[PDB]
Structures are given as C-alpha cells and as structure tokens.
Symmetry: C2
Subunit: 328 residues, 2 copies
C-alpha cells in the first residue's frame, strides 16, 4: 500500500514557487481494527493555505480537505465504497480511524457533482452563509459590498444576499469574472484592476453607501470601502487575500477618524465556529438553494495530483474561474 | 457687550503651534426674547479637537464645551446666575436661544468642583462608561487593557472596571502617571515610553491575554495589543490619538491573519449616541461613584482664556496630569 504526498520543502516568500514544494512517495501501514484506507477523489485548494502554511515545519504535509472513497475498511460505520470528507492534507491515500471524517448529506443528489462538498455546499458556502447571515446580519433591503466576488466564498455571498433581497455590489479581478457575476444577478459588478478610481466607482455603484461589507481581500481596497460605509455599517472580516503574499510591510490601516465618526462594527470570524445543528441547517439550505437554481456553481477542475502546487499557485494568482479542485 | 474668541488661523500641520490660532474681539448683539448671555467660567480642551479642527474653514471658531453662567436673561427657564453646559466654542461670552444648553444635575453638590461637569461627571466619563459597559460589555472577571489610561477617558474606564471586578492593565506616558494610577488601584500600570518591548510587557502583565481593550491611541500600539487578545476579544474603538498629530502616511494596519484567527470584534463609538434616560442614568451613576470615592479625579487647571491654545497644545503633547481645564 503506497501513497504520494506534497510537502512544504521551504517556507514561502511572497508567492509560492515550484521549488517550495516536494512530492514524496511513501508506504502506508496495514489497517488496525476501526481503521479505513481512503482514496482521494477530489482535493481542494483554498486561499487560507497560504496563511496556514506558515504554521508548518519544512517537511510537513500541506494541509487541506478532500472527497475520498473508502477503498479498504475495518470500520463497520464506513464500508468499502463510502464517500467521505477528510482533511489528511495533500495526499492521494490516507489511513483514518473514522473520528476525523464526515459522510455527505443523506439527501445528497446524484445530479450534482461530488466536488461541491468542497465548495458551494461545503466550507466556502458555509463561510459565505454564516459571514453574511450571522456576522453581517443582513435582513433584506441592505446594500452589501463583496470583494473577491467571483471567488468560492464571494459568489455564494452575493447569491445569498440576492435571495434575501439585497442590492449586491461585487468586485472582481478579471472581465471573464465580471460577465460571470452578472449572469448570477449581482446588481453592480466591476473589475477593480481596470477601474480608473475605486473610490468613484464605489460611489457611482451605491451613492447612498454600504450597509454591509463582506471583506475577503483587506488592505487599501478595504480602506476605500470603509470610507463609504453607512453609519453603524457592519463589516465581516473573512480574509485578507491581498496581504497573504506580500514581501513588504502591511499597508496603512482603516482611516481611524472615519471608522469612529461612522461608528462601524467590524467582526472577524472563522467558519469552524459553527458546528452541530446550526451547521447542518446551513448545509441543507445551500443544498436546497443549489437545486432550486437560486445558487449557481462553477468549478475549475485540474486533472492530476502532480498538478496541485500549480492549482494552488494558479488560484492564488487569480488565474481560475470557478472553485479550484484537483481531480485525482 | 464684547467677547473674545479663539479662531483657527491656519490648519494644523502635525501638532499645532501658536501661530495657527488667532484671538479676535467681537461685539455681541442685544438679546432677543428667549435668549440668554453666557459668560464662560471653565472651558475644556480635549484630544478630539485636533481631529475636528480639520473640518473647520480657517477663520472659524475653535469648537468646544464650557461651564457658563447666565449673566443676562430674557428666558424664564434660565434666570441670571444659572449654571449650564454650553458649546459655543472657544469663546468667553456667547448667546443662546436656550435649547442647546444643559443645566447640571439636580442633585449636584457644593462639595465637588463645577469643572467635573466637563470631565469625570461629564463627556469623558460618559465615554468611558458606555465604551466599557456597552461596547466592551464587561461583566466581571475579565482582563481589560486600557491605553492613555491616566487621561480623561482612560482613568475612568479603569476605575469603573476595577469596581465591576476586572483586572485592569493600563499604559501611560509618564512615571508620575504610573504612580498616580497605582494609587487609584489599577492592577498593572506602565510607561509605554520607557519599556524595552511593549509586546513583552503586555505578555508579563497578562500571560493569558486580554478579554477587552478600550482603545484611545491606535497605530502600532494597537497592533501589538491585538496580538495578545483572547479568542473572541472585544475592542472598543474610542479614539486614535497617536495618529492625530502624525505627519506622514498612517502606520501599518492591524495584522489581519491574527484578527481573523482570534475572531475579534471591534466596534467604534461616539458618546453622543446615548441620550435620554440612558445618558442620565450614567451621569447619576458617575456622580454617585465620585461621592462614594469609587472614582477619583484629578484636574489640571490653567488660568486665563488667552492661555487656551497653549493649554490645548500641552494637552496634546502629554504635558499634564489630570483633566485639562481653562479657568476664565
Ligand atoms: Cl469498528
Ligand atoms: Cl471501493
Ligand atoms: Cl475575484
Ligand atoms: Cl478584488
Ligand atoms: Cl478556489
Ligand atoms: Cl422664555
Ligand atoms: Cl450673575
Ligand atoms: Cl499610552
Ligand atoms: Cl496617559
Ligand atoms: Cl484632557
């Protein structure tokens, strides 16, 4: 029994590079009672991994989630054939004792792709859902600003806000991505890389200002948004992608007189806070809404486990339209 | 009747200097029916005036609150001799229609100075009260970080926090202020100017982190504190005084990966949000606590209305121990 695994050969300095990763082949032990051998079917790459990777030692396996098939079982809860979510990292095969795994929703249809369990009806959809519904606390009627809005979190956020009856303003890094989010029914979408002035564009997009800001990117982009927040505006801090790969100091912060005069609430959050019933209800909603056509999905599938570092690097550069997913 | 008024001659570049202010003498109109003539007894200077003054046109009067006596009345609610809070700016005499004024508390004793109405039992005490009890929402048993902690706002925050059963860690700018706050019963107090490393002082002062941070200073000081916040820690953003007089770009914002990881809540506030009964219950709670000795106060009184800019500059530059009042 053999496995292939991507390790961190070297801590990243700015953007990752091929030389910071190393593929190692390895013999997997035999199964003890209560254990299963899992075969990776679909592996995800996500922005957080740029950040989570600083917590690793050189030689450690890259963290990450997958959809795996149980190929060998000594666990009666999980027979051969069973499909599960698992986070053994960037690895083709892994041994699990059962207790770190998740079967899919019972009601899960054959008419949707299994890899949605890693996207829209998985962790990024849950991030959108809870960030928007619990942290921004949108009610309906509100004007929501969402950035990295063609990203896996962003695009779900906007689609949930539309079906709660909000105006949604979305910012995007490419013109393919602009067209895509207009198909999905966002009120105003623009390419931030091409606009002459973010300030003027955001002003023309909601002259009123923004009730809510779902922030994925941070930096000077967020400083500009903060200057057009309505009084008692709410900000959900989900990520700061524009900062993860920097080589210098952080940009200036939110201009503090504006934050104070406007009495803003900013609250940061991580998806994993919500477990139990709250989480299962959220998943079931994301499933409902997908099947009703209220949330549309798109995937960028890269064939082959050899191509994972490239998938990650591509996603980080903004090269891909859809959730990046490696088939394997 | 004449008045003297301090105007903004020139917009401040970094700190103010004397030449940015101009004293003018002006004749006042006779009173119409329902109006009163106010003579200033005590005027305040406050950090926010540095920020607010950026919104003035040159020639404009400096903004600010005072304790004033009604010396001429055509208003039956406000007979000669009545003491009021008023905000005509930095002027010795002004005219009111009476509807923008505030009489002192009914139960206001002779055994305290009138000028506490501009400080501890006034705007800065209210700032502390609501920032701490509503925004930080301290319940008791929590460790509170307060900066500019021997200032008008910070010293009250610390004393209310003590009396609600919190550990209080205060940062201060002089060793006289360190001494003073230790007499007031703060748990840890230090001089942020003398300490070798802020990071390490905060780490020894609360090994377990900070539940709440009442933030008056902002900038790099705050970035260091954020690195020490407990998970789900609460920041009340009240001011950012370290930035008001700063001549360059703003310093690096708070490090987003830590904010997100710790799921921090930051909320900005202005005192004038709380009005009506809530505001009155707070003024009565503050005055009660003063009489009981649970809140001590220190004033730095400066004689003469012509000394008001120097007073302001001395306040901004950390010159003084106690609330800066001009008699006036
Ligand atoms: Cl078993
Ligand atoms: Cl099988
Ligand atoms: Cl995007
Ligand atoms: Cl963007
Ligand atoms: Cl993605
Ligand atoms: Cl009258
Ligand atoms: Cl009189
Ligand atoms: Cl300080
Ligand atoms: Cl101080
Ligand atoms: Cl003061």
């Amino acid at each position: 029994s053999m496995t292939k695994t991507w390790t961190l050969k070297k801590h990243f300095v700015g953007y990752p590079t091929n030389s910071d990763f190393e593929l190692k082949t390895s013999e997997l032990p035999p199964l003890k009672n209560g254990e299963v051998l899992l075969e990776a079917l679909f592996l995800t790459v996500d922005p957080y991994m740029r950040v989570a990777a600083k917590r690793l030692k050189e030689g450690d396996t890259m963290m990450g989630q997958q959809v795996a098939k149980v190929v060998e079982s000594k666990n009666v809860a999980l027979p051969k054939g069973t499909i599960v979510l698992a986070s053994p990292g960037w690895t083709t095969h892994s041994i699990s004792d059962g207790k770190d795994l998740e079967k899919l929703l019972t009601e899960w249809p054959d008419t949707i792709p299994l890899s949605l369990a890693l996207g829209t009806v998985g962790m990024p959809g849950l991030t959108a859902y809870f960030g928007l519904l619990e942290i921004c606390g949108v009610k309906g009627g509100e004007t929501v600003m969402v950035n990295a809005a063609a990203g896996a979190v962003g695009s779900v956020v906007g689609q949930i806000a539309k079906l709660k009856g909000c105006k949604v303003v979305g910012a995007v890094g490419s013109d393919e991505k602009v067209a895509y989010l207009q198909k999905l029914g966002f009120d105003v979408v623009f390419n931030y890389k091409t606009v002459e002035s973010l300030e003027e564009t955001l002003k023309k997009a909601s002259p009123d200002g923004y009730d809510c800001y779902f922030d994925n990117v941070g930096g000077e982009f967020s400083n500009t948004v903060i200057g057009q927040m309505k009084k008692f505006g709410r900000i959900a801090i989900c990520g700061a992608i524009s900062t993860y790969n920097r080589t210098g100091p952080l940009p200036p912060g939110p201009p503090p007189e504006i934050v104070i005069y406007q009495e803003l609430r900013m609250e940061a959050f991580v998806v994993y806070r919500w477990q139990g019933d709250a989480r299962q209800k959220a998943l079931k909603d994301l499933l409902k809404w997908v099947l009703e056509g209220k949330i549309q999905y798109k995937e960028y599938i890269i064939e082959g486990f050899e191509n994972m570092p490239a998938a990650f690097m591509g996603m980080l550069k903004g090269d891909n339209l859809g959730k990046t997913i490696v088939k394997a």
